Design a protein around this nucleic acid. Structure first.
Ligand code: D4T
Ligand code: MG
Ligand code: MG
Lengths: 555, 412
DNA sequence: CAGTCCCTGTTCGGGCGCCG
DNA sequence: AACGGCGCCCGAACAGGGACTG
């Protein structure tokens, strides 16, 4: 006969055709034994745990770990087999709150519900599926087995149920206090208002008593009344916020797992520290698949790590969001496919920073990557503030206009203005729209043998110029690119080029300025040196003009 | 007082599990206000995380409308109940709708909110309202009545809709009325004054039973087609002829009678691209014969009601957009071109969005289906912006392609 | 006409950061 | 040694189209 808590239960079922968990316990240390028998006894008197007998043919192992910055221990149930047989839940946690999206509040209070999962009841018909034994001695007493009447820590349904139960309890209080903001993340509650400090504590106590009606305790050890407040890993001051101090490891020998933790902290640090790079550090995490393998730091990876530590030396901070002012986002090119941005409302008062360094595609240009960075910032800004910022971009209006009007794919950038801060993003070469009068016409072609991987590449021109080059360990696609490279090498500043390669033409028409292919990078260098280039395509094997002639040479 | 028509998913398919995407502030505030009124009216009810299903939701504004309209992306749920709204209680498609001089589209989806939904099926209509900066967890609801945008709603309501439209159809035997999703397509050959008068009579006929005041007008008798046309120059260069042979060789996949023998003979040798080539007698003859074949209709091109419609769109530049609708490759059921739409010369995404809506509307009128689109755009670019410009109560299927224009086939 | 190849793209699961 | 959430950078598995060979 256990009392029923005021919190409405959540009906939890299991996947049909499957039963409950039946897993044997794990032999643990005697230190863990003297830290769980006291928990199952206190939760038994408080009604959070009931004792079962032989009528419960289930079992599940459990372990214990120390709480972060606390003398109290934390108990976790290894429900990995129960989760495989428990129904799926839809997670109501859609993201992580960010301090740059908080608005200025005169009074702020950060609460923390004590015994979060241990205060929300479990479904009645589901408590029988949570069976576990507790041996008082490691090899003497068999130990009486108990069960769970609340949410266990370790079950895949516990977070979703608590987050939904917490919302239902706060809904009447939020309806009675509309001007009070309550950021609700798991058990921690950020409460802010523009009320006076005296009147703010009044509503806080009202909220503490409102939650108490459903058995939710808000102790004083985790009650924060004085700034700075520790919230979501940040330091919340009345007029600014900053990330908690980030410590980078400094080992004399660097392995693989050390770099994975290093790049991770730098990614986390890049939300407020401007100009962080992880290109050369993550470049070391390629190919090698041994987390315990020492990797030497390259000269580029060392200079990158040095410049990041100097950025972390000076203290930085973000500000809060003011809806009465516009959102501004400004991007700079860091080089080598790296971009960094700042989002602010007043000059030099950054809400947050960030970086975009993803290299998508074998061949691309700076304009494509700038467009991708804009799209990333836009989506991030809608999550945090629910609106798109005005952009300040290091690209001329004329440059952007030339790109998007001539590109064959739909592309667009939201309202933006040009900011003249080098290095400016530009198009490094423009293909002509019409054939050039007076320029030599090169008919290029390449062929390769599928078996021997041998091939030829060459050209014929209207003036009688001709070349055929034998190639080893190549492909048809490579020989077609080589043929174009030959025509660019052997021509003047203005040249017309006729190819049948859809593959090659598709790469070059997109005006790439960088490539994972050395051959394409050499083709780009030639295209930049030219004054006029006209690429034309004809179908292969159709007896069309000089294409028929050069086809004979290379095949 | 109405028994719920039982609804079942297709055999071997579970409900939809699609994550909600981030919404702007004005859209979240619109949905919060809308859903609060729907809950007070019992149309939707709050749910918990034990419902593993979810469907994205956002809001739109129709053309020339300042009122927010809740829009659910039931695309996943719709194709998981396909045996219902196509086999059991399907809606016949009138072939005469596309022949009417004027067709008005009426949002009648509000009527679906009066019919209850099958209790065993309500869990599949779950949606989640997000919050700015994740201040609060998602606010989950499920539908208690027939939801707008679900293909099962017009099918279940069809028996009710038939009885409502029965006096009007008897009063006007010439008017063609078609129902697709939340919309009612009313077409007549009456004059513009007579048509809108008859449309208002239909509105009052529905009132005696929040977007019924709107009427988007169409003119399918004025809908044009964009055939493959060949350039006509006074002089021809080597480059002009190379492009022509390239266009004709690709067009041969559609018209098998196209020849390029005489035109290719003009390029014998290794000539400069800008050299003028006079067209021979046989070349003029072959080119003239090719211009006639491109006027003749393609052989064996007809609509198969069992196959899906496919739509390809090409960005031609300067606000020009071409498109083709087909079921089998090179068997195009319709080819067209749009020009000077909203966002022209400034916004590709708005233009592409407008083109998708126009093409879908034409497909609903002509065949009663929406096509699956092949969009010339990056997935991330489209998914960032398309909801900002969407003005329709339905959503078609789409995929993303990248085809460089090796030869300008549909627009010189 | 199929079956490959070459090449480029997306999807996904795990590594790490971080929150509870 | 547990659960859920978001982000990044990584590689393996897979898909899809031009193009060549039987
Ligand atoms: C940190 C953490 C948390 N949780 C779950 C359990 C309770 C809530 C909050 O945890 P908590 O605030 O640190 O401890 P809690 O149970 O609230 O008890 P108190 O220390 O607040 O009194 O999230 C978890 O399952 N695993 C974890 O590692
Ligand atoms: Mg707590
Ligand atoms: Mg070739």
């Amino acid at each position: 006969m256990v009392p029923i808590s005021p919190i409405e239960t959540v009906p939890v079922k299991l996947k049909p055709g499957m039963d409950g968990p039946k897993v044997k316990q794990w032999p643990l240390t005697e230190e863990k034994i003297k830290a769980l028998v006291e928990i199952c006894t206190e939760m038994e008197k408080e009604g959070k745990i009931s004792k079962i007998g032989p009528e419960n043919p289930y079992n599940t192992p459990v372990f214990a770990c120390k709480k972060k910055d606390s003398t109290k221990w934390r108990k976790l149930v290894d429900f990995r087999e129960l989760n495989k047989r428990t129904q799926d839940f839809w997670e109501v946690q859609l993201g992580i709150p960010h301090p740059a999206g908080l608005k200025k509040k005169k009074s702020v209070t950060v609460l923390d519900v004590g015994d979060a999962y241990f205060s929300v009841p479990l479904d009645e018909d589901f408590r029988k599926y949570t069976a576990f034994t507790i041996p008082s001695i490691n090899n003497e007493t068999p130990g009486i087995r108990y069960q769970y009447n609340v949410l266990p820590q370790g079950w895949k349904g516990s977070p979703a149920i608590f987050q939904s139960s917490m919302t239902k309890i706060l809904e009447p209080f939020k309806k009675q206090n509309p001007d009070i903001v309550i950021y609700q993340y798991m058990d921690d509650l950020y409460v802010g208002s523009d009320l006076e400090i005296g009147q703010h504590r009044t509503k806080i106590e009202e909220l503490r008593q409102h939650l108490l009606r459903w058995g939710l305790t808000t102790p004083d050890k985790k009650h924060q009344k004085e700034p700075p407040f520790l919230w979501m890993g940040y330091e919340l001051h009345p007029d600014k916020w900053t990330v908690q101090p980030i410590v980078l490891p400094e080992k004399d020998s660097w392995t693989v797992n050390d770099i994975q933790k290093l790049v991770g902290k730098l990614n986390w640090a890049s939300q407020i520290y401007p100009g962080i790079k992880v290109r050369q550090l993550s470049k070391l995490l390629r190919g090698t698949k041994a987390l315990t393998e020492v990797i030497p730091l390259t000269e580029e990876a060392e200079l990158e790590l040095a410049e990041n530590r100097e950025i972390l030396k000076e203290p930085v901070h973000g500000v809060y969001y003011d809806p009465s002012k516009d959102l501004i986002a400004e991007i700079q090119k860091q080089g080598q496919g790296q971009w960094t941005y700042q989002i602010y409302q007043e000059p030099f008062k950054n809400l947050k920073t960030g970086k975009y360094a993803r290299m998508r595609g074998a061949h691309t240009n700076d304009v494509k990557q700038l467009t991708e960075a804009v799209q990333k910032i836009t989506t991030e800004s809608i999550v945090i503030w629910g609106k798109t910022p005005k952009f300040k971009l290091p690209i001329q209006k004329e440059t952007w206009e030339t790109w998007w009007t001539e590109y064959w794919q739909a592309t667009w950038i939201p309202e933006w203005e040009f900011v003249n801060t080098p290095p400016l993003v530009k198009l490094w070469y423009q293909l002509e729209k019409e054939p050039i009068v007076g320029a030599e016409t090169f008919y290029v072609d390449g062929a390769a043998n599928r078996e021997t991987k041998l091939g030829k590449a060459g050209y014929v021109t209207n003036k009688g110029r001709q070349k055929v080059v034998p190639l080893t360990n190549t492909t048809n696609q490579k020989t077609e690119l080589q043929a174009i490279y030959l025509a660019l090498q052997d021509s003047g500043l203005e040249v017309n080029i006729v190819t049948d390669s859809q593959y090659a033409l598709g790469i070059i028409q997109a005006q790439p300025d960088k490539s994972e292919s050395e051959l394409v990078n050499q083709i780009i260098e030639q295209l930049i040196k030219k004054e006029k280039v006209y690429l034309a395509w004809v179908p292969a094997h159709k007896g069309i003009g000089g294409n028929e002639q050069v086809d004979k040479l290379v095949s | 007082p109405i028994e719920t028509v039982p609804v079942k998913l297709k055999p071997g398919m579970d409900g939809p599990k699609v994550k909600q995407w981030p919404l702007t502030e004005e859209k979240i505030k619109a949905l919060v206000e809308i859903c609060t009124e729907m809950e007070k009216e019992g149309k939707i009810s709050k749910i918990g995380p034990e419902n593993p299903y979810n469907t994205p939701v956002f809001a739109i504004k129709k053309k020339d409308s300042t009122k927010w309209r809740k829009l659910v992306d039931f695309r996943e749920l719709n194709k998981r109940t396909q045996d219902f709204w196509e086999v059991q209680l399907g809606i016949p498609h009138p072939a005469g709708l596309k022949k009417k001089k004027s067709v008005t589209v009426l949002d009648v989806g509000d009527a679906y909110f009066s019919v209850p939904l099958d209790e065993d099926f309500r869990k599949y209509t779950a949606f989640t309202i997000p919050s700015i900066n994740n201040e609060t967890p998602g606010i989950r609801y499920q539908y208690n009545v027939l939801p707008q945008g679900w293909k099962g709603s017009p099918a279940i309501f069809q028996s009710s809709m038939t009885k409502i439209l029965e006096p009007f159809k008897k009063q006007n035997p010439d008017i063609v009325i078609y129902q697709y999703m939340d919309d009612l397509y009313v077409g007549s050959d009456l004059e513009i004054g007579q048509h809108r008068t008859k449309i208002e009579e239909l509105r009052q006929h529905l009132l005696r039973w929040p977007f019924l005041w709107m009427g988007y007008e169409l003119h399918p008798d004025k809908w044009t087609v964009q055939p493959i046309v060949l350039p006509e120059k006074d002089s021809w260069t080597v480059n002009d002829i190379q492009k022509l042979v390239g266009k004709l060789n690709w067009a041969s996949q559609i018209y098998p009678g196209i020849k390029v023998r005489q035109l290719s003979k003009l390029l014998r040798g290794t000539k400069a691209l800008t050299e003028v080539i006079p067209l021979t007698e046989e070349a003029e003859l072959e080119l003239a014969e090719n211009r006639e074949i491109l006027k003749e209709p393609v052989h064996g091109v007809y609509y198969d009601p069992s196959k899906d419609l496919i739509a390809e769109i090409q960005k031609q530049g300067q606000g020009q957009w071409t498109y083709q609708i087909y079921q089998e490759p090179f068997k195009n059921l319709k080819t067209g071109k749009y020009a000077r739409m909203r966002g022209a010369h400034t916004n590709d995404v708005k233009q592409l969005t407008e083109a998708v809506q126009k093409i879908t509307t034409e497909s609903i009128v002509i065949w009663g289906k929406t096509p699956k689109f092949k969009l010339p755009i990056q997935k991330e670019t489209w998914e960032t912006w398309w909801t900002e410009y969407w003005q329709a109560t339905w959503i078609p299927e789409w995929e993303f392609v990248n085809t460089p224009p090796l030869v300008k086939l549909w627009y010189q």
